[PDB]
Amino acid sequence: NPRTVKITASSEETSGENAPASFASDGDMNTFWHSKWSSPAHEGPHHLTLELDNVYEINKVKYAPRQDSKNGRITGYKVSVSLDGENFTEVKTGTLEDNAAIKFIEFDSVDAKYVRLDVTDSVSDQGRGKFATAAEVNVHG
Ligand SMILES: OC[C@H]1O[C@@H](O)[C@H](O)[C@@H](O)[C@H]1O
Numbered sequence: 001n002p003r004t005v006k007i008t009a010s011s012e013e014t015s016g017e018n019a020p021a022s023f024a025s026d027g028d029m030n031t032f033w034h035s036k037w038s039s040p041a042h043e044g045p046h047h048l049t050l051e052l053d054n055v056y057e058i059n060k061v062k063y064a065p066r067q068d069s070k071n072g073r074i075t076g077y078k079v080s081v082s083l084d085g086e087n088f089t090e091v092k093t094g095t096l097e098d099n100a101a102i103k104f105i106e107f108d109s110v111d112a113k114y115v116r117l118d119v120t121d122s123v124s125d126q127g128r129g130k131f132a133t134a135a136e137v138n139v140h141g
């Protein structure tokens with residue numbers, strides 16, 4: 001029910017491959033957002049912010065890792081909510097297992113128009129923290 005109308009990111013890759021932030025919001029597990037890795041690489045801090053079409057009561061973020069590589073797989077996160085897009089309130093901080101499984105970050109119900117996923121840690125095939133990727137990210141109530 002919470003519907004993402006817009007997604008913005010710290011950075012995105014569109015030169016070395018086509019991996020824009022919108023690819024984290026397109027319902028397709030075969031497309032991923034990637035932080036900019038082509039020179040000059042953006043090495044963080046990485047984040048993804050979802051703008052919803054209304055204020056929703058939310059209690060879960062789904063984070064589906066890219067399925068073809070561990071590059072940018074998020075292992076450390078903060079989730080924050082906002083009504084205006086500038087003033088955020090942290091609702092959850094934690095770690096995520098280093099595997100390709102869809103992750104479900106759960107917290108007490110809270111109103112949000114914007115949901116920001118800040119990366120505090122990530123892994124790579126090779127590395128830590130340099131990249132961030134997501135096949136899909138969305139929010140649920
Ligand atoms: O160096 C970063 C890059 O590494 C590549 O091997 C991978 O195909 C890209 O998606 C990107 O993660």
Ligand SMILES: [Ca+2]
Pocket residue numbers: 023024025026027028029030031032033134135136
């Ligand atoms: Ca996708």
